[model samples]
Target: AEYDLKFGMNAGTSSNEYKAAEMFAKEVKEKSNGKIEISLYPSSQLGDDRAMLKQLKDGALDFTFAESARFQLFYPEAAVFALPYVITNYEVAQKALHDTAFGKDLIQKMNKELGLTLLSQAYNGTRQTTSNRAINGIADMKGLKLRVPNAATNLAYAKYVGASPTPMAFSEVYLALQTNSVDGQENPLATVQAQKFYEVQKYLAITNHILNDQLYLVSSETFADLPEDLQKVVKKAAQKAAEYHTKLFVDGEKELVTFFEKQGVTVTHPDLTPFKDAMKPYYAEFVKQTGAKGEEVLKQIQAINK
Candidate 1:
């Protein structure tokens, strides 16, 4: 019997996410002798990351691409990554969490606790601020309503940090940019350019605030029920897809950032001290309640450059 996997992802065919998904599908077909297959559904056709995660929790989805912020439902410690200016560099940021031993352990635990197997950490840069009006710091975020996800962490962080994060769909953000219902929104460059947020938002702050990592999940039930050799093939395919996805991210980031500049959006990465300071109290509570392993993971990430 052929093993058909449901791979629910957020971005559309135009996204590097699809590029990553296709790579995974190719590897599974090749390595599994065509016994296994991943059916891709992009653009949240199935649902957004959080919704897919909900289905994954109930064992409805075989697999899905999710981000750190969405994990706040089960793993609030993971929310730290979504805070603004939390990571200075992309490779460095990921290396701190995605590549390190402690990071891997945390991912494993996060998966097990959530009843899913983490296959890969799909790469994407930090979320930046976009706006129709001139902006500089956290003060600018005041009274400037912005679209955000429904995640508790995002809403909490937004309120504490400044912006009134409105939970809107990715499909609606571009139009929201046009209508001024939202003064600004935050997302990666590929997202900013892919959706043409530059045309509506005059300012794009280089606020690499929250780094994003898609948690590529395979249902534990699905994996457990698979044949041993087939399971190995699936894992191998996941790693291959991850390698390709990471490499592709480098080019995508460059392309989108450059495109935004050419499109005439004022983009600048301001000193994140202000943003970081805003979320300062989050760490104490996060570390204390998220378990010892969580704190270890955080420490490991901070020790990245060293």
Candidate 2:
């Protein structure tokens, strides 16, 4: 019997996310000897990230890519990755995520508690601030209203910087910015281009506050339904798909800044030391929320990134 898996995400059709998902679907069919087929639904044609997550949990959806930060609702410990300035550059961030003890631990914990299988991780680039006003430093952000994904760590980042954070879905952000529903929002350069946010926003503040990594996730409900041989094939195919996405993400980021700049978006890379210093107090709060093991994971990531 052939099983058709529906893979969902909010990324654009041209995004590496869709490319990666398409690659995974191709490889799965080839490796499974036609036993499984994954169909891609980009631009949230299936639903938003929140709805997709619930569907995955209930086994209504087969697979999806969501910001790992969003999982903090069910597993606060996942917020360890969402903590401010935890991983700085793309190179170090990727190395830390793939080679750290926290990486292994996160995989085990997500499967154990959430009934979700971690297929792999897709690099989401270093999230930076974009606003209608120039944000040259931390002071400029004071009382600035910012759009944030409906995730606690993201909201905390906005608040800690004195910006009023408004939680909104990604699909609705462009019009929201155009209408001044929020003064600004934060995302990677790739996202800034893919979503055409540059048309509405004027300044790009390279805050690098959160190093985002989207997860390649599969519900355990679907995984367990597969036979042992098929299970191994899916994992192997997923690993290859992740590797492909990594190359696209790394290479694409090098050009995206220039791409955005050509579109008339003013890009400024601010001195992030003070912003980093300001976030120190929040570390303890993260530790307290995620518990002791989460603290250890944080420590391990810091050590690895050093």
Candidate 3:
């Protein structure tokens, strides 16, 4: 093979992310006709998402997966993708990113300034809450120590909803929940199952608070170096893999509830009206910090839900 590439991700082999990545690698190799090969590094062997992204910027990493919201680390306005309750569903997320003007602009900005290429986006899952005690209503959230990733939007989800947000790395969450270091945490149902949070957490609340969308990104330097034919091969394979990735999450969401129940985890579907209402001030704060551009993006995303 004339071109050898490296793809890295934080997800371990058991994860759907890794499964999709494997499919991507296989398709790319097949499509490229033995002229290109991709090597996979899972479980953050390359580094965490942040470290991998930096590697991509330096053209040391060829490809990796990142949540759309993770772009907020470099572009504050990108945080709109993650603001709790803003994106109603994966359909809306897809439309907001591909069909909206704001989405197109962000894509261009990323490529032009960040040394990365945006190939495709896939549905991750909607985040739900898991706790040590029952959460029958919004009142149950008050004073609950909720473990949240060290992201602004997630932390805000905890605060505006009345829980004391505890920022922690994902690796520490299982131990935190087990030792009562934190009362609860929020993540996709598939993640809860993958991490076996059911083993320590007794209650699951269908908060549906945040929608996650992962991006298939390539280092622009690596992509530009490829022949046009090989570039097309990479892009097409990425899109195909993204579709498969979405199917995995969509299918898993339908069945994970029963799986958790079998494990003795109580699942509740609390009315989300109050949960959405609680985020009003957080939305205001986002607009306050991001100014007119932020408000415009928020409006654009909301328009899609209608």
Candidate 4:
């Protein structure tokens, strides 16, 4: 019997996310001898990431992409990655994603606790801050109304960094910046460009605040209802797509700095030591919130590639 599936994401068709979704569909069809068909919807045709995540959790949507910070809405401990300054460099970030016990535990807990099937940690890129005004250092972040995802950890991180955090939907960010509803927003360079925030925001402070990872999630029940053979096909296809996305990201980040420059965004590299030192209190807060499990995972992340 042929099985049909749907995948939804908010990124544009040109984004690595859509590319990964397309690859998953192609590989699944080839491997399953056309027994499985996965449809792709880009640009939030279905809905924004938040709504899509809700559908996946409720089994209304078969598959959706969620960012690590936003995933905290359902599993607050998902905030582990959103903790300020934890993932400081891209090399260590990639290592932890593929090789750490933390990655495995997060995936396991999503299935067990959130009623969602973990598919892949689809690479997005490290998040950076963009503002209309220059942020030369940690002092510039003080009391500035910055837009963050409506997730607890993101809010906490903004506050700890001395920014006044305002939560907003991703779809509304460009306008928010244009209207001065928020002073700035944090996202990767690719996202700032793709979402057209670069047109409205002037300064690109390469804060690299979070090593952002996009989650490929599906309804737990839908995955469980699949036949064993097809389950293997879906899992393999998902991994292949994730690998494809990782390659796209690594190559893309190399050139995007110049790309943003041509678009006339001033890029600044701030001394992040102050930002890092300021976040210890929040790290303590995260440990207190998630207890030993969060502590173990954080240590496992730190120990990777060391």
Candidate 5:
């Protein structure tokens, strides 16, 4: 018998996220020889990541790729990725997840402790500050109301910088900016443009304050329910999708700034040294809560290109 899996993602075809979902769909269909097919709901049409996670648990959604931060609330151990400025670049992120002896064990831990199999750990790049204000450097951000994802890392960065942290849902952000519920939001270029934030905001500051790892997750609930042979097929297909999408992430980020610029978003590159300095204390703070294992992961990340 054949099964069709419905998957959810955070953005539409116009965004790179959908490019990932599209590639995943093609590979799954080809790899399974048509026995297994993937159906996609784009542009967050299925709902926010956490809400979709519940649906996946109930067997409603078969799979989804979401920001790893949302997964952190489930397993604090997953917070290793979101700690500000810790894993600075893509090569390091890739090496830490792939080359290190600890990477395999960490993935195994996530599946066992968190109940979602992590097929790939990917780079969304460092998040930046973009708004309709003159935010060229650290000093320019003072007294601004900066919106961030509804998460602690986000709050930490906003606090480290001068802006007051305003947490909001992804869907509500454009309206928030337009209606002045908030002045600006921090996100990757692809995400910022997907939501068309450029329409309401004018200035884009490269704070690059945080890095996000997008997780390709299959509910353990669903994987456990599948037949043994089917589970192997699913996992293999996920790996194939991961390899293809990693390239997409690297290439997509290159053109993303141009996309925003065409929309008249004034992208500003600031000296991140000052901003990075502002948040260094959080490393000590995060390790205090997360302990030695967390510190070890950060150390492995730094060794990637050094």
Candidate 6:
């Protein structure tokens, strides 16, 4: 208990992110023989991912979670990770981040330039669509108002699918949906359940638009200050917690359809062919804006699916 650290995140107690973070904190304390303890700040208590990431760089926060695409704020090319339909599934997502040349280099740059150490990556679940009205196919998305996080890739997903994209904070989505301020929203099943979106939205669509991977990151300042033995404890604990985090998402995805249905929400699996086809222009736009760097990242990600 000589060292006390802080970990902050936007996810609440109901999320797998929070559960895994809890596991990581417990393991770190036990493995370090009570020499180090991590206190968690959940539900954006400290700040959102953007603010928390800045805190990490300034050495004001010890730990936090973020998606690879969030790195776009620092390196624009990182946005390719969340480009619609590019990453096929969790397996491909894992390979794209750990096995690709770009992936390895990004991690290095993050540590060197941002002063944040990448600890581990966990499956955060693929995003699906939910609306007050059924989204049977591409046609149904035409001109529909959709709420998306204020992220470029997510906004692009809504625009390319012919939806009017409205960027908003996560805390305000339920009210937006209830008031018909936004016709629908997109998120993983666990998020839908955790946020109680099924109570306000009538239909859930199997869009499978984006695969999310959450990263466990620590402030390099805090990490470097730890003794070698304690450093190993934190790293190993993160790896174990990441495995548990992925398992929670995998298991939840398998059973959440029934959970939604039981809550009186109708679920639909529309053909994704038209949905995929719709993104061609947006993909081109991405390459046009990011040039060769973005193109190469896109190509490497697609190769993983093959």
RMSD to true structure for each model, in Å: 3.0, 2.4, 1.3, 2.7, 2.7, 1.0
Q: How many pairs in model 5 have backbone atoms within 3 A of each other, for residues 3 or more apart or on separate chains, i.e. clashes?
A: 1
Candidate 3 backbone collisions, by pair:
none
The sequence of per-residue lDDT tens digits that candidate 5 reaches over residues 168-194 is 777788898998778888887767766
What is each predicted model's overall lDDT from 0 to 1?
0.74, 0.83, 0.92, 0.80, 0.75, 0.93
Question: What are the clashing pairs of model 5?
Answer: 11-43
lDDT of 4 by residue, 163-264 (tens): 999998787888989999899998777777678788898888978777777767889988998889989988888888888887888788898888878989
The candidate, 1 or 3, that scores higher on lDDT is: 3
Q: In candidate 4, where is summed lDDT lowest over 10 consecutive residues?
A: 89-98
- Predict model 6's lDDT versus the native: 0.93
What C-alpha lDDT, on a 0 to 100 scale, does residue 85 get in candidate 4? 80
Query: Cα miss at 170, model 6 (Å)?
Result: 0.9
Model 3, 1-306: lDDT tens digits are 888899999777878998999999999988888888999998889988889998988999999999989989988988999999999998898888888988888888888888889999999999999999999899999999999988899999999999999998777889999999999999999889888899999999999999999999999999999989999999999999999999999999999999999999998888899999999999999999999999999998998863
Compared with the true structure, the alpha-carbon lDDT of candidate 2 equals: 0.83
What TM-scores do the predictions have? 0.85, 0.89, 0.97, 0.87, 0.86, 0.98
In the predicted model 2, the residue pairs found to clash are: none
lDDT of 2 by residue, 2-71 (tens): 8988898888887778888888998999999999988888888988887887788889899989776676
Error in Å for residue 52 of model 6: 0.7
Give the poorly placed runs of model 4, Cα more than 4 Å off.
43-54, 68-71, 89-105
lDDT order of candidates, top first:
6, 3, 2, 4, 5, 1
As for candidate 4, its clashing pairs are none
| Full candidate order by TM-score, most accurate first | 6, 3, 2, 4, 5, 1
Pairwise lDDT winner, candidates 1 and 6: 6
User: Which candidate wins on TM-score?
Assistant: 6
* Candidate 6 segments exceeding 4 Å error: none
